[PDB]
């Protein structure tokens, strides 16, 4: 990020997969703090979205725990866009959107979570996932359960496909980095 060497987008154009290896390979690897993370990623804040792009990005990657970033799935994240990786973006989809470490969907709780993910856009998104999730979410809960298990979320992810692809596009590389933090 920042700095005065080459461009972040330039690296994105190449993108192979081992890039993250360079990350852990370079610098004092062993857990990344918010300050160290923020440098590794760019972003343009202003107000509320400020705490939403940090909390939303850190909250999704907080994987159960929080207060720091534990490098582990970072490679998987790269595989998220690299070589398509449809199945890989599938797992992330569910992983990112649900409660901290609770895969169970309470409808109301997920909704808010999806808002953070859709809140990852400082500018007004062409189509927020919030409305998408609502339409898809409502259809999923045919029995009016009010809650959806991991399996239901997976069906919703596969269903429509087109929307899911849009979410996939949101889960880009340069955009994701910018979303992470300045």
Domain ranges of the chain: 8-180
- How many CB atoms neighbour CB 105 within 10 A? 27
**Phi/psi at 148 (nearest 5 deg)?**
-130, 130
9 touches 144 (CB < 8 A): no
C-alpha span between 95 and 77 (Å, rounded): 11
- Best CA proximity match to 157, nearest among 103, 108, 119: 103
Enumerate residues 6+ apart whose C-beta is below 8 A from 79. 17, 85, 88
Enumerate residues 6+ apart whose C-beta is below 8 A from 91. none
CATH of domain 8-180: 1.10.238.10
**Helix, strand, coil % in the chain, rounded to nearest 5:** 55, 0, 40
* Coil/strand/helix, residue 50: helix
C-alpha span between 172 and 142 (Å, rounded): 32
C-alpha span between 119 and 80 (Å, rounded): 20
Q: Is 51 left (phi over 0), alpha (psi -120 to 50) or beta?
A: alpha
């Amino acid at each position: 990020g920042d700095s005065s060497s080459m461009s972040a987008t330039e690296l994105s154009a190449c993108k192979c997969h081992q890039w993250y290896a360079k990350f852990m390979t370079e610098c004092p690897s062993g857990q990344l703090t918010f300050y160290e993370f923020k440098k590794f990623f760019g972003l343009k804040n202003l107000s509320e979205k400020s705490n939403a792009y940090v909390n939303t990005m850190f909250k999704t990657f907080d994987i159960d725990d929080d207060g720091c970033i534990d490098f582990m799935e970072y490679v998987a994240a790269l595989s998220l866009v690299l070589k398509g990786g449809v199945q890989q973006k599938l797992r992330w989809y569910f992983k990112l959107f649900d409660m901290d470490g609770s895969g169970c969907i309470d409808k109301d709780e997920l909704l808010l979570i999806f808002k953070a993910v859709q809140a990852i856009n400082g500018a007004e998104p062409e189509i927020s996932a919030e409305d998408l999730a609502d339409i898809v979410f409502n259809k999923i809960d045919v029995n009016g359960d009010g809650e959806l298990s991991l399996e239901e979320f997976m069906e919703g992810i596969s269903a429509d496909e087109k929307i899911s692809e849009m979410l996939t596009q949101s889960l880009d590389l340069t955009r994701i980095v910018s979303n992470i933090y300045n």
